[PDB]
Amino acid sequence: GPDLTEDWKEALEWMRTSLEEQNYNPYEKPEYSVMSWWDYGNWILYVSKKAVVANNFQAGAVDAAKFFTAKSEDEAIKIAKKRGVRYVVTADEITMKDANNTKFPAIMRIAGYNVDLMTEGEILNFFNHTVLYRLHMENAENLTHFRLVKEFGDVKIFEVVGS
C-alpha cells in the first residue's frame, strides 16, 4: 500500500529506539514487541529477527484484529500477553472517525465479522464498544492494562502495563 506517513515513521523510530536498549537468552524475548495494523507493503520493511513486528504477516493481522475488536479488556490483554507485546499503536485511520476513510471494516473482516451485513450505524455502535475505542477515543483512561505514552500526530503509542 501507500508509504507510511511521517508520523508513523517517527512513531516506529521512537519505539525502535526504546526497544534497542533491551538486553536478553534470545528465547526470553517476546514473539514480537509492537502490535499495530499493518499494510503488507509497509510490514515487509520491518520484519526480521529483531522481532519488532510479527514474523508472519497474516498471524500478526489476526492478532491485531482480534485485539482491537475485543469488547473486554481481559480478552485484549490476553492476546498482548501471549505475544509479549510492549507497545500497541493506534491512529485515526483504524477508527470510525470517517466512515468513508477507515480501515476498521477491514479489521472487523479479518477478526471474522461479516461487517458487510451491517449498516453504517451498526458498525459505529460495534466500534464504540471495543477496546480500540477505549484506547484511541479515551486515551486508555478507562483501561487498567494500557497507558498512553507517546503521540505523533494522531498516531498513539500505548505501553502494556506489566509487559
XYZ file of N, CA and C in Angstrom:
489
model
N 0.836 -1.234 0.000
C 0.000 0.000 0.000
C 0.850 1.256 0.000
N 0.235 2.441 0.132
C 0.975 3.707 0.144
C 2.008 3.776 1.268
N 3.064 4.552 1.051
C 4.122 4.695 2.044
C 3.564 5.188 3.372
N 4.195 4.768 4.466
C 3.770 5.188 5.795
C 3.958 6.692 5.915
N 3.054 7.343 6.640
C 3.134 8.783 6.840
C 4.341 9.093 7.717
N 4.698 10.369 7.791
C 5.830 10.793 8.600
C 5.588 10.494 10.074
N 4.350 10.672 10.524
C 4.022 10.402 11.919
C 4.233 8.928 12.232
N 3.863 8.060 11.295
C 4.038 6.630 11.511
C 5.513 6.268 11.547
N 6.286 6.820 10.614
C 7.716 6.539 10.568
C 8.390 7.008 11.853
N 7.972 8.174 12.341
C 8.502 8.746 13.578
C 8.150 7.870 14.775
N 6.895 7.437 14.830
C 6.434 6.591 15.921
C 7.232 5.292 15.928
N 7.399 4.693 14.752
C 8.141 3.445 14.644
C 9.596 3.630 15.057
N 10.154 4.803 14.773
C 11.540 5.093 15.133
C 11.682 5.299 16.640
N 10.672 5.908 17.253
C 10.692 6.140 18.694
C 10.644 4.799 19.421
N 9.835 3.876 18.907
C 9.714 2.565 19.525
C 10.959 1.719 19.304
N 11.534 1.801 18.110
C 12.740 1.035 17.816
C 13.834 1.475 18.783
N 13.947 2.785 18.977
C 14.944 3.346 19.878
C 14.701 2.863 21.302
N 13.436 2.817 21.703
C 13.089 2.362 23.043
C 13.379 0.873 23.210
N 13.212 0.113 22.130
C 13.441 -1.331 22.153
C 14.909 -1.700 21.977
N 15.651 -0.850 21.277
C 17.073 -1.093 21.018
C 17.889 -1.280 22.299
N 17.415 -0.667 23.376
C 18.074 -0.709 24.677
C 17.896 -2.040 25.417
N 16.943 -2.848 24.967
C 16.673 -4.135 25.604
C 17.818 -5.131 25.442
N 18.071 -5.900 26.499
C 19.122 -6.916 26.510
C 18.574 -8.182 27.161
N 18.540 -9.270 26.397
C 18.035 -10.542 26.898
C 19.150 -11.573 27.003
N 19.365 -14.593 27.053
C 18.910 -15.584 26.094
C 17.932 -14.965 25.089
N 18.011 -15.385 23.817
C 17.124 -14.859 22.773
C 15.731 -15.486 22.848
N 15.600 -16.467 23.734
C 14.348 -17.185 23.917
C 13.394 -16.537 24.910
N 13.904 -15.656 25.768
C 13.034 -14.971 26.721
C 12.354 -13.820 25.984
N 12.912 -13.471 24.829
C 12.405 -12.383 24.006
C 10.980 -12.641 23.522
N 10.120 -11.611 23.565
C 8.721 -11.715 23.131
C 8.590 -12.166 21.676
N 7.444 -12.751 21.324
C 7.224 -13.178 19.943
C 7.450 -11.947 19.076
N 6.922 -10.814 19.531
C 7.134 -9.535 18.865
C 6.779 -8.412 19.834
N 7.368 -7.243 19.613
C 7.197 -6.107 20.510
C 6.107 -5.095 20.215
N 5.777 -4.924 18.944
C 4.784 -3.932 18.567
C 3.558 -4.515 17.889
N 2.387 -4.150 18.395
C 1.143 -4.599 17.793
C 0.477 -3.421 17.108
N 0.309 -3.525 15.795
C -0.308 -2.454 15.026
C -0.998 -3.064 13.814
N -1.781 -2.252 13.110
C -2.484 -2.709 11.923
C -1.602 -2.366 10.737
N -0.978 -3.392 10.173
C -0.064 -3.209 9.062
C -0.605 -3.474 7.675
N -0.006 -2.775 6.718
C -0.288 -2.964 5.308
C 0.936 -3.798 4.947
N 0.736 -4.880 4.208
C 1.843 -5.752 3.843
C 3.064 -5.016 3.296
N 2.834 -4.079 2.382
C 3.935 -3.332 1.795
C 4.829 -2.617 2.788
N 4.244 -2.155 3.888
C 4.990 -1.454 4.924
C 5.671 -2.462 5.853
N 4.900 -3.462 6.272
C 5.359 -4.521 7.172
C 6.630 -5.221 6.692
N 6.707 -5.494 5.396
C 7.866 -6.182 4.840
C 9.184 -5.461 5.123
N 9.106 -4.154 5.356
C 10.288 -3.343 5.627
C 10.771 -3.453 7.073
N 9.917 -3.957 7.955
C 10.278 -4.069 9.365
C 10.474 -5.492 9.883
N 9.956 -6.479 9.159
C 10.075 -7.864 9.594
C 11.524 -8.360 9.558
N 11.957 -8.951 10.669
C 13.305 -9.503 10.821
C 13.355 -10.209 12.172
N 14.498 -10.797 12.513
C 14.612 -11.494 13.790
C 14.723 -10.551 14.991
N 14.639 -9.249 14.737
C 14.682 -8.262 15.812
C 13.360 -8.415 16.559
N 12.386 -9.002 15.870
C 11.068 -9.256 16.432
C 10.316 -7.988 16.828
N 10.391 -6.957 15.994
C 9.668 -5.723 16.272
C 8.208 -5.995 15.905
N 8.006 -6.594 14.737
C 6.669 -6.935 14.262
C 6.539 -8.449 14.153
N 5.322 -8.924 13.906
C 5.074 -10.357 13.785
C 5.851 -10.981 12.626
N 6.446 -12.144 12.876
C 7.216 -12.861 11.859
C 6.355 -13.263 10.671
N 5.082 -13.544 10.940
C 4.134 -13.956 9.911
C 3.085 -12.857 9.775
N 2.986 -12.278 8.582
C 2.048 -11.187 8.344
C 0.605 -11.478 8.719
N 0.059 -12.578 8.204
C -1.324 -12.950 8.479
C -1.613 -13.160 9.962
N -0.696 -13.822 10.663
C -0.875 -14.074 12.087
C -0.899 -12.747 12.837
N -0.025 -11.833 12.434
C 0.029 -10.530 13.070
C -1.252 -9.750 12.835
N -1.824 -9.899 11.644
C -3.058 -9.198 11.299
C -4.221 -9.737 12.127
N -4.302 -11.058 12.242
C -5.373 -11.667 13.016
C -5.219 -11.275 14.477
N -3.984 -11.281 14.977
C -3.735 -10.889 16.365
C -4.273 -9.479 16.599
N -3.864 -8.549 15.745
C -4.287 -7.163 15.894
C -5.794 -6.978 15.762
N -6.405 -7.673 14.809
C -7.845 -7.556 14.613
C -8.615 -8.098 15.822
N -8.211 -9.258 16.330
C -8.884 -9.836 17.488
C -8.717 -8.926 18.700
N -7.541 -8.324 18.809
C -7.236 -7.431 19.918
C -8.075 -6.160 19.840
N -8.043 -5.501 18.686
C -8.780 -4.258 18.514
C -10.293 -4.408 18.613
N -10.833 -5.512 18.101
C -12.278 -5.729 18.144
C -12.797 -6.350 19.439
N -11.899 -6.662 20.370
C -12.318 -7.243 21.641
C -13.242 -6.275 22.372
N -14.263 -6.817 23.031
C -15.209 -5.996 23.781
C -14.775 -5.851 25.237
N -13.956 -6.785 25.709
C -13.474 -6.742 27.085
C -11.956 -6.630 27.118
N -11.449 -5.814 28.033
C -10.011 -5.628 28.155
C -9.312 -6.945 28.482
N -10.004 -7.824 29.202
C -9.436 -9.119 29.566
C -9.037 -9.934 28.341
N -9.864 -9.889 27.302
C -9.581 -10.620 26.071
C -8.425 -9.968 25.317
N -8.390 -8.640 25.333
C -7.338 -7.903 24.645
C -5.976 -8.145 25.291
N -5.906 -8.021 26.613
C -4.644 -8.213 27.308
C -4.141 -9.649 27.171
N -5.060 -10.601 27.042
C -4.666 -12.000 26.884
C -3.838 -12.160 25.608
N -4.287 -11.525 24.531
C -3.577 -11.594 23.259
C -2.214 -10.912 23.368
N -2.204 -9.705 23.923
C -0.965 -8.959 24.082
C 0.039 -9.705 24.966
N -0.444 -10.307 26.050
C 0.437 -11.041 26.954
C 1.044 -12.246 26.249
N 0.215 -12.961 25.497
C 0.659 -14.142 24.772
C 1.834 -13.837 23.852
N 1.754 -12.726 23.128
C 2.822 -12.357 22.207
C 3.957 -11.575 22.853
N 3.769 -11.151 24.102
C 4.802 -10.394 24.792
C 4.970 -8.972 24.281
N 3.929 -8.461 23.640
C 3.928 -7.110 23.090
C 4.131 -6.053 24.168
N 4.965 -5.060 23.866
C 5.220 -3.965 24.797
C 4.415 -2.743 24.382
N 4.282 -2.553 23.072
C 3.549 -1.412 22.541
C 2.397 -1.774 21.622
N 1.319 -1.007 21.751
C 0.143 -1.146 20.906
C -0.007 0.243 20.287
N -0.190 0.304 18.975
C -0.290 1.595 18.304
C -1.604 1.769 17.560
N -2.224 2.933 17.733
C -3.487 3.242 17.066
C -3.326 4.524 16.250
N -4.339 4.847 15.452
C -4.327 6.054 14.626
C -5.758 6.299 14.173
N -6.066 7.518 13.743
C -7.435 7.806 13.317
C -7.907 6.854 12.226
N -7.003 6.497 11.320
C -7.342 5.619 10.198
C -7.999 4.284 10.540
N -7.698 3.707 11.702
C -8.317 2.426 12.035
C -9.572 2.564 12.883
N -10.034 3.801 13.052
C -11.234 4.070 13.838
C -12.360 4.508 12.909
N -13.540 4.732 13.478
C -14.690 5.148 12.685
C -14.864 6.661 12.629
N -13.758 7.390 12.742
C -13.796 8.849 12.687
C -14.448 9.280 11.374
N -14.047 8.631 10.287
C -14.588 8.923 8.966
C -15.047 7.605 8.355
N -16.357 7.419 8.252
C -16.907 6.186 7.697
C -16.459 5.932 6.260
N -16.071 6.994 5.559
C -15.629 6.880 4.169
C -14.116 6.807 4.006
N -13.401 6.802 5.126
C -11.946 6.711 5.117
C -11.546 5.985 6.388
N -11.769 4.676 6.389
C -11.477 3.867 7.560
C -11.046 2.444 7.225
N -10.182 1.895 8.072
C -9.698 0.534 7.903
C -10.381 -0.366 8.925
N -11.257 0.205 9.751
C -11.933 -0.604 10.761
C -12.776 -1.722 10.143
N -13.452 -1.457 9.013
C -14.236 -2.559 8.445
C -13.318 -3.724 8.054
N -12.131 -3.403 7.540
C -11.169 -4.425 7.145
C -10.728 -5.193 8.382
N -10.490 -4.466 9.468
C -10.085 -5.090 10.720
C -11.180 -6.050 11.180
N -12.430 -5.600 11.119
C -13.553 -6.441 11.512
C -13.607 -7.722 10.679
N -13.401 -7.604 9.369
C -13.428 -8.774 8.492
C -12.363 -9.792 8.882
N -11.144 -9.314 9.111
C -10.039 -10.191 9.491
C -10.322 -10.867 10.831
N -11.042 -10.169 11.706
C -11.392 -10.715 13.013
C -12.514 -11.743 12.883
N -13.075 -11.863 11.682
C -14.135 -12.831 11.456
C -15.558 -12.299 11.457
N -15.719 -10.982 11.475
C -17.056 -10.403 11.473
C -17.527 -10.137 10.047
N -18.813 -10.365 9.810
C -19.402 -10.143 8.496
C -19.898 -8.700 8.468
N -18.957 -7.765 8.525
C -19.258 -6.338 8.541
C -20.136 -5.860 7.385
N -20.047 -6.540 6.247
C -20.821 -6.163 5.071
C -22.324 -6.372 5.217
N -22.725 -7.085 6.267
C -24.139 -7.321 6.541
C -24.575 -6.363 7.640
N -23.730 -5.372 7.912
C -24.023 -4.384 8.938
C -24.200 -2.997 8.329
N -25.090 -2.205 8.917
C -25.325 -0.847 8.443
C -24.218 0.028 9.022
N -24.047 1.225 8.475
C -23.013 2.121 8.976
C -23.247 2.382 10.463
N -24.513 2.509 10.846
C -24.850 2.749 12.239
C -24.462 1.598 13.150
N -24.626 0.372 12.663
C -24.281 -0.813 13.443
C -22.765 -0.942 13.598
N -22.022 -0.583 12.553
C -20.563 -0.655 12.601
C -20.032 0.361 13.609
N -20.634 1.546 13.627
C -20.216 2.586 14.556
C -20.495 2.143 15.984
N -21.677 1.576 16.204
C -22.048 1.108 17.529
C -21.103 -0.008 17.982
N -20.757 -0.906 17.063
C -19.846 -2.001 17.380
C -18.518 -1.383 17.804
N -17.996 -0.499 16.961
C -16.728 0.170 17.239
C -16.696 0.828 18.621
N -17.759 1.543 18.976
C -17.791 2.227 20.264
C -17.708 1.336 21.502
N -17.929 0.034 21.345
C -17.846 -0.865 22.493
C -16.562 -1.685 22.516
N -15.638 -1.387 21.606
C -14.385 -2.142 21.528
C -13.274 -1.565 22.390
N -12.226 -2.359 22.577
C -11.072 -1.919 23.339
C -10.386 -0.815 22.528
N -10.455 -0.918 21.200
C -9.855 0.101 20.340
C -10.477 1.460 20.649
N -11.786 1.482 20.886
C -12.446 2.743 21.209
C -11.862 3.270 22.517
N -11.772 2.397 23.514
C -11.239 2.790 24.811
C -9.783 3.224 24.747
N -9.058 2.753 23.738
C -7.669 3.164 23.581
C -7.611 4.529 22.900
N -7.993 4.558 21.630
C -7.917 5.776 20.836
C -8.860 6.923 21.188
N -10.121 6.615 21.471
C -11.090 7.665 21.785
C -11.000 8.186 23.213
N -10.547 7.348 24.143
C -10.456 7.757 25.544
C -9.039 7.752 26.105
N -8.045 7.588 25.235
C -6.644 7.551 25.652
C -6.367 6.562 26.786
N -7.087 5.443 26.777
C -6.929 4.387 27.775
C -7.221 4.831 29.204
N -7.979 5.909 29.358
C -8.298 6.400 30.694
C -9.067 5.362 31.499
N -9.875 4.559 30.813
C -10.675 3.535 31.468
C -10.138 2.126 31.270
N -8.853 2.025 30.948
C -8.203 0.732 30.758
C -7.130 0.595 31.832
N -7.093 -0.549 32.506
C -6.114 -0.751 33.570
C -4.778 -1.330 33.115
N -4.756 -1.967 31.948
C -3.531 -2.590 31.458
C -2.825 -1.856 30.325
N -3.294 -0.659 29.993
C -2.695 0.109 28.908
C -2.524 1.569 29.286
N -1.362 2.122 28.955
C -1.056 3.512 29.259
C -0.569 4.272 28.021
N -1.193 5.410 27.727
C -0.760 6.217 26.591
C 0.585 6.833 26.975
N 1.616 6.573 26.175
C 2.946 7.098 26.470
C 3.546 8.035 25.429
N 3.008 8.036 24.215
C 3.556 8.907 23.183
C 2.553 9.132 22.064
N 2.660 10.282 21.409
C 1.772 10.631 20.309
C 2.533 11.377 19.225
N 2.237 11.040 17.976
C 2.865 11.670 16.820
C 1.714 11.942 15.868
N 1.170 13.154 15.926
C 0.027 13.469 15.090
C -1.130 12.731 15.739
N -1.820 11.880 14.987
C -2.922 11.121 15.567
C -2.506 9.677 15.823
N -1.219 9.397 15.645
C -0.691 8.062 15.904
C -0.424 8.021 17.408
N -1.085 7.106 18.109
C -0.922 6.997 19.556
C -0.215 5.705 19.945
N 0.784 5.821 20.817
C 1.538 4.660 21.280
C 1.164 4.360 22.726
N 0.679 3.146 22.959
C 0.278 2.705 24.288
C 1.249 1.640 24.769
N 1.621 1.704 26.041
C 2.513 0.696 26.589
C 1.669 -0.275 27.399
N 1.966 -1.559 27.262
C 1.245 -2.579 28.004
C 1.788 -2.573 29.431
N 0.900 -2.387 30.400
C 1.295 -2.347 31.803
C 1.544 -3.756 32.320
N 2.789 -4.031 32.691
C 3.128 -5.345 33.201
C 3.768 -6.243 32.163
N 4.181 -5.668 31.037
C 4.815 -6.451 29.984
C 6.291 -6.696 30.282
